[PDB]
Design an enzyme around this catalytic site. Structure first.
Site, PDB file in Angstrom:
ATOM      1  CG  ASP A   1     -11.479  -6.689  18.068  1.00  0.00           C
ATOM      2  OD1 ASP A   1     -12.114  -5.901  17.533  1.00  0.00           O
ATOM      3  OD2 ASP A   1     -10.355  -7.109  17.330  1.00  0.00           O
TER       4      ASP A   1
ATOM      5  CG  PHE B   1      -0.517  -6.558  16.297  1.00  0.00           C
ATOM      6  CD1 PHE B   1      -1.106  -5.406  15.542  1.00  0.00           C
ATOM      7  CD2 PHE B   1       0.161  -6.422  17.528  1.00  0.00           C
ATOM      8  CE1 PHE B   1      -0.884  -4.191  16.247  1.00  0.00           C
ATOM      9  CE2 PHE B   1       0.422  -5.324  17.857  1.00  0.00           C
ATOM     10  CZ  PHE B   1      -0.421  -4.225  17.665  1.00  0.00           C
TER      11      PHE B   1
END
Ligand code: BJG
EC number: 2.7.10.2
Length: 282
Positions: free
Chosen positions: A134, A18
């Protein structure tokens, strides 16, 4: 807050997934000086990746707390046709890397200080109705041996106004309702925090959550069969074991975070007070 590309000079690559992050120097006086910063870039600007990167930037810019990495600005590079995020540079990198490398710069006093600091950063996130989604030591950054900060707001969601959860993977940190219903909440962040507390007390040794859950599940299992067995194990009280040398009272905090009953998990405010009382009483 707006950094010119011609003055942002590369120093070092810091991480790649990413996107990637580099250390840079911002030297607008072109004399080999300037502040050192961390620069995050995409590695694809699609309609969706860029919308999400913009949301991550707005989220980080909206936060100002001692235990959250400091937003500094954005750089619109490639002649203003690309976007990079500028943050402060924290020299000791991720907490996952720091614990594993500097294993005795670190004692339980330091571990409980880091635990407190993460809890306080998360309390601050809760005031903005942000769900991190996360929380893991890979996403916590180390300023120095006495100060860590939460980073990586790439997966962070804002609670709708009338709802206590957001419906949306690092499966070995996920709460059971996030696995079965895709529901994220402050309470699922507390579940993940219990896994971060476990990671601290394992000092990142074959003891990682994926390693230990795969031992419990069956090391030979692959693909969705892993997820099926991890859900069934968690729903019936399977948990990570107490780390070697971890005090029972710190294991009790992990155990209480890992409650299947979402509303019975403690809040981050409860956790910061309990941890700081433990610190103050020793
Ligand atoms: C940690 C990380 C891993 C992979 C990727 Cl793609 C990005 C990041 C990341 C993020 C993030 N996740 O948003 C933020 C940062 C960040 C922000 C501020 N300061 C730093 N400092 C830092 C990062 C890494 C190090 N390392 C220390 C040890 N060596 C092995 C690896 C690099 C030292 C310092 N990182 N990083 C590196």
């Amino acid at each position: 807050t707006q950094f010119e590309e011609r003055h942002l000079k590369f120093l070092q690559q810091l991480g790649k997934g990413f996107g990637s992050v580099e250390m840079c120097r911002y030297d607008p006086l072109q004399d080999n000086t300037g502040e050192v910063v961390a620069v995050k870039k995409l590695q694809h600007s699609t309609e969706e990746h860029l919308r999400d990167f913009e949301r991550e930037i707005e989220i980080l810019k909206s936060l100002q707390h001692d235990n959250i990495v400091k937003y500094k600005g954005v750089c619109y590079s490639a002649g203003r046709r690309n976007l990079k995020l500028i943050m402060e540079y924290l020299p000791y990198g991720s907490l996952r890397d720091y614990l594993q490398k500097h294993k005795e710069r670190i004692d339980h006093i330091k571990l409980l200080q880091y635990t407190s600091q993460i809890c306080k950063g998360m309390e601050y996130l809760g005031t903005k109705r942000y769900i991190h989604r996360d929380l893991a030591t890979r996403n916590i950054l180390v300023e120095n041996e006495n100060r860590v900060k939460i980073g990586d707001f790439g997966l962070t969601k804002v609670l709708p106004q009338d709802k206590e959860y957001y419906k949306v993977s690092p499966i070995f940190w996920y709460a059971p309702e996030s696995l079965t219903e895709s529901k994220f909440s402050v309470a699922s962040d507390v579940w993940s925090f219990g896994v971060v507390l476990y990671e601290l007390f394992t000092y990142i040794e074959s003891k990682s959550p994926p390693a230990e859950f795969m031992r419990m599940i069956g090391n030979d299992k692959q693909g969705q069969m892993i997820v099926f067995h991890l859900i069934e194990l968690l729903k019936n009280n399977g948990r990570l074991p107490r780390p070697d040398g971890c005090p029972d009272e710190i294991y009790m905090i992990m155990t209480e975070c890992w409650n299947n009953n979402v509303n019975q998990r403690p809040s981050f405010r409860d956790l910061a007070l309990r941890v700081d009382q433990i610190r103050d009483n020793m």
